[PDB]
Scaffold this active site. Sequence first.
Site, PDB file in Angstrom:
ATOM      1  N   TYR A   1       0.858  -1.022   0.141  1.00  0.00           N
ATOM      2  CA  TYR A   1       0.053  -0.075   0.076  1.00  0.00           C
ATOM      3  C   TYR A   1       0.986   1.334  -0.031  1.00  0.00           C
ATOM      4  CZ  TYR A   1      -5.257  -0.301  -0.054  1.00  0.00           C
ATOM      5  OH  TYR A   1      -6.318  -0.464  -0.345  1.00  0.00           O
TER       6      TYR A   1
ATOM      7  N   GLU B   1      -0.206   4.679  -1.016  1.00  0.00           N
ATOM      8  CA  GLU B   1      -1.048   6.051  -1.271  1.00  0.00           C
ATOM      9  C   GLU B   1      -0.518   7.183  -1.269  1.00  0.00           C
ATOM     10  OE1 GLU B   1      -4.059   4.465   1.789  1.00  0.00           O
ATOM     11  OE2 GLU B   1      -5.419   5.546   0.099  1.00  0.00           O
TER      12      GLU B   1
ATOM     13  N   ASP C   1      -6.072  12.669 -26.595  1.00  0.00           N
ATOM     14  CA  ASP C   1      -5.816  11.058 -26.044  1.00  0.00           C
ATOM     15  C   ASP C   1      -5.257  10.031 -27.110  1.00  0.00           C
ATOM     16  OD1 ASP C   1      -6.343   8.213 -25.653  1.00  0.00           O
ATOM     17  OD2 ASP C   1      -8.486   8.560 -24.867  1.00  0.00           O
TER      18      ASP C   1
ATOM     19  N   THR D   1      -3.019   4.824 -22.884  1.00  0.00           N
ATOM     20  CA  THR D   1      -3.186   3.615 -22.272  1.00  0.00           C
ATOM     21  C   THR D   1      -1.710   3.192 -22.597  1.00  0.00           C
ATOM     22  OG1 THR D   1      -4.128   2.776 -24.290  1.00  0.00           O
ATOM     23  CG2 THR D   1      -5.404   3.253 -22.563  1.00  0.00           C
TER      24      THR D   1
ATOM     25  N   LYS E   1      -2.033  -1.094 -25.585  1.00  0.00           N
ATOM     26  CA  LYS E   1      -2.005  -1.481 -27.002  1.00  0.00           C
ATOM     27  C   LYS E   1      -0.937  -1.380 -27.730  1.00  0.00           C
ATOM     28  CE  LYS E   1      -6.503   1.108 -26.611  1.00  0.00           C
ATOM     29  NZ  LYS E   1      -6.196   1.283 -25.252  1.00  0.00           N
TER      30      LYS E   1
ATOM     31  N   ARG F   1      -1.677  -3.265 -19.035  1.00  0.00           N
ATOM     32  CA  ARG F   1      -2.877  -2.614 -18.689  1.00  0.00           C
ATOM     33  C   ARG F   1      -2.887  -1.547 -17.606  1.00  0.00           C
ATOM     34  NH1 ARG F   1      -6.303  -5.860 -22.156  1.00  0.00           N
ATOM     35  NH2 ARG F   1      -7.832  -4.110 -22.151  1.00  0.00           N
TER      36      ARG F   1
END
Lengths: 442, 442
Positions: free
Chosen positions: A54, A56, A208, A234, A237, A243
């Site tokens: 974790y 954050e 984008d 992203t 691709k 991902r």
Amino acid sequence: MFNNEPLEQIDKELHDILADEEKRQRETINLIASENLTNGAVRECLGNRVSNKYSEGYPKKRYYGGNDFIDKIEELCQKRALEAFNVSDEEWGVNVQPLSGSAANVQALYALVGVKGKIMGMHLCSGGHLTHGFFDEKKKVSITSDMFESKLYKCNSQGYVDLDAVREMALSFKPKVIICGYTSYPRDIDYQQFRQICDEVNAYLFADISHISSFVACNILNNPFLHADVVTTTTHKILRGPRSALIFFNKKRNPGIEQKINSAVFPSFQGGPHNNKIAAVACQLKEVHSPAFKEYTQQVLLNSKALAKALISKQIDLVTNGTDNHLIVVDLRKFSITGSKLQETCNAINVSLNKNTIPSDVDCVSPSGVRIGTPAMTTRGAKEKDMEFIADVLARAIKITVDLQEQYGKKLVDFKKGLPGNAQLQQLKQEVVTWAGALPFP
Amino acid sequence: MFNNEPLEQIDKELHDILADEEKRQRETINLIASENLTNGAVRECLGNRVSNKYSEGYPKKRYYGGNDFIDKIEELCQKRALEAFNVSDEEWGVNVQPLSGSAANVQALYALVGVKGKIMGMHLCSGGHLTHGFFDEKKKVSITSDMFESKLYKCNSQGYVDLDAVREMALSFKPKVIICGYTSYPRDIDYQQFRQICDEVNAYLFADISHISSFVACNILNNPFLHADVVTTTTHKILRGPRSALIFFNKKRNPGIEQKINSAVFPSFQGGPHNNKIAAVACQLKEVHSPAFKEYTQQVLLNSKALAKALISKQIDLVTNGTDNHLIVVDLRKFSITGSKLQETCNAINVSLNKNTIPSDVDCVSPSGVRIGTPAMTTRGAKEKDMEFIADVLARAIKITVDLQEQYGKKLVDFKKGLPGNAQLQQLKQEVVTWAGALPFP
Ligand SMILES: Cc1[nH]nc2c1[C@](c1cc(F)cc(N3CCC(CCC(=O)O)CC3)c1)(C(C)C)C(C#N)=C(N)O2
Ligand SMILES: Cc1[nH]nc2c1[C@](c1cc(F)cc(N3CCC(CCC(=O)O)CC3)c1)(C(C)C)C(C#N)=C(N)O2
Ligand SMILES: Cc1ncc(COP(=O)(O)O)c(CNCC(=O)O)c1O
Ligand SMILES: Cc1ncc(COP(=O)(O)O)c(CNCC(=O)O)c1O
Ligand SMILES: [Cl-]
């Protein structure tokens, strides 16, 4: 107090399905424009125990300590990201925590305009993404049309972005953001003319570039970084990462954007980042910046041009009659078959593609095309001469689809009854499997 | 056309940081209440090639084909999740696509109330999550306070949920949803009294059980599924899954909720699911249902009770003076040290914990406690006997923190200068490493 038996032993049921999935990927002509194949190194990162942590917040300014090694990974990812897209860390910033493309876009848009804010993007039917404001008469389908006030611009009847309409809309609508860079757009984007339009009305320029990331990175296509306030992409691709997603922001054009974007990602929208993703993104961004990967990206375009040419040679019509990038949209109106029918036919022969709207489609119901792309098959080693075979298989599926429609009728549920057992499909499937199963597989 | 050299070769720089991270995990007393350690099987799923597949939509009703094996996995996960939490698939549904806890909560809330909708949750300072509507006087810090209209209820001076205040607020505020289940709440929840208050005002009952999921599954604590309209949970804390989330919805109490939640997850908020996550969640949800995992979970409570007891034996005060679950919040006011200072001290001895507010803290600026919990160390094999040692190390860290504060003063920047080189810390670090490094490690 845990079971450390391997996957095969711990869960034989799941493991079989996954070995089956692997065999289907291995024996498929994958033409999904948005898909690729990750190497072993990227997949080693994704299964690394770094996802136990974790962390954050942001490097150094974490909520917890014990994050020294996580801070290096996350700083190494940011650096390698700015290097890859040829931007100065003094002029550009990058957030590497967004879990995926859609999250990245919603967060970035919120940073810029907030709730009730006004945005403009390309219509879904014309090749825009859901997260670019998509709605329809019946519903605000995307959160981007509901938490924001969105207006949508269309391409012209030839498939090209219509800039005269964008201005007509931007002038009257007065958005704070205009979105360009698309999901099924076969041509390059004139970002400079976008930048000119945004200046005129005072809106931000949002690029984008998820589908064309490698091309921008390798300077094979236009550079949105010269004109844009925000760039999202992203990593899974054509870039060939895991991902995940990246948000880029132009500090020089907009000081204090750095804090708006980082706070939008956390704590506005997300909690703990996924450090296995960040590690994986790091690993791929190093490959992106080699000369080897530029060779690969160039092959993607070479293959796509060749695929375009061979389909035209076989009298198949393409939206915009060609491509400047990795993807083609096939207009199927002259055969009187829908894209859904050809998608099923292609699924039966281990050819992966998707149904896709064309300019003439009023609705997104019953789209009249399919979209294909080359990044996946280019990763698997296909060259220019290999594209005639893919063009041949696609031509043969279109013909079979037409035959089956005549025999069984135009209803989709009736059409599907013809598919199982069809001798030509079995023959074609077999031909696909033999060529596909042979290609290199990461 | 790809590089398949292993991670060490492809990227030596990254591989060293990751091997360093692994060494730090193995030599740490990890008391972060929200952390755990995934087994090798879960990590094999996460690195699986199944993450190559775009599979937007839901099983069968997919946008693309080629999703036969992905549909089995996603249906297997749904099934195994409904089994694990002792719910009938006729009465309850589950969405397995949310990428993480916070995404899961924003999507679920949006489904129920939409933009501008009214929600109620526990304040962050009182142990609620950010996604439970957290704002503060200066800003709407979570999107849940901005895209929704939220109101926040506090726990009383002893750290207990004040149900009389929830009703005081619910009756005047008239929310459409009331959130219970928390991030740093050491006691069990009276869901029935929440279900009683929600009926009275006509609001939905939302239970976020991310921290107490294993207890709920194994019937060691109260069951919100008897009372709630929606239950969310992360899969990576006490449940010991990958980083992902689950949204559960009550068909019987609310027909037509199923579509709302699924449409909220996609296409309102997300794009393509991450199938490597879904597989990994499937793999763990099988372990969850075994009687072995119930043994593990019971041990988490045994260790936490013993840990609470041993800290009280050493005169350390706990919020609510104890715990019914996996976590303890330590009140540090009698030592005149902040939680931030003890977090730094503990990081220096390879003790992972976090600073945490207590009831008396007006703001979130100077939290006066730390939160600890046992799932991680219980996974590593620590029994009740071992908790005295953890309690001893924490007492010794508190003492050292008090010493260092005396010498260097109460400013954090000053305090930290005392930390590097301090003989006792080096000594205590070494004691921690020697005990931690020995313990079993998945
Ligand atoms: C699935 C998806 N996501 N984003 C996309 C798509 C694309 C797509 C193709 C298609 F045939 C249909 C659709 N949709 C039709 C309308 C759907 C609305 C569903 C709802 O109301 O919940 C949303 C998805 C979306 C393809 C790339 C797959 C698309 C197109 N054409 C565009 N432009 O972008
Ligand atoms: C980091 C985090 N996430 N969710 C949490 C926290 C906790 C936390 C502890 C803490 F000391 C501080 C905070 N924050 C203080 C306010 C911060 C606001 C940042 C901003 O203005 O953007 C958000 C995080 C949050 C811990 C569990 C780590 C917390 C508490 N106390 C509660 N209740 O829940
Ligand atoms: C332009 C664009 N932006 C964002 C996304 C969202 O990515 P996530 O799936 O990671 O949310 C997509 C994916 N579009 C799907 C496709 O082209 O097949 C996209 O094409
Ligand atoms: C009750 C609750 N709900 C949702 C989340 C969000 O999970 P993601 O980080 O996967 O977004 C948390 C995170 N818990 C933070 C902690 O206790 O350490 C939580 O405690
Ligand atoms: Cl992942």
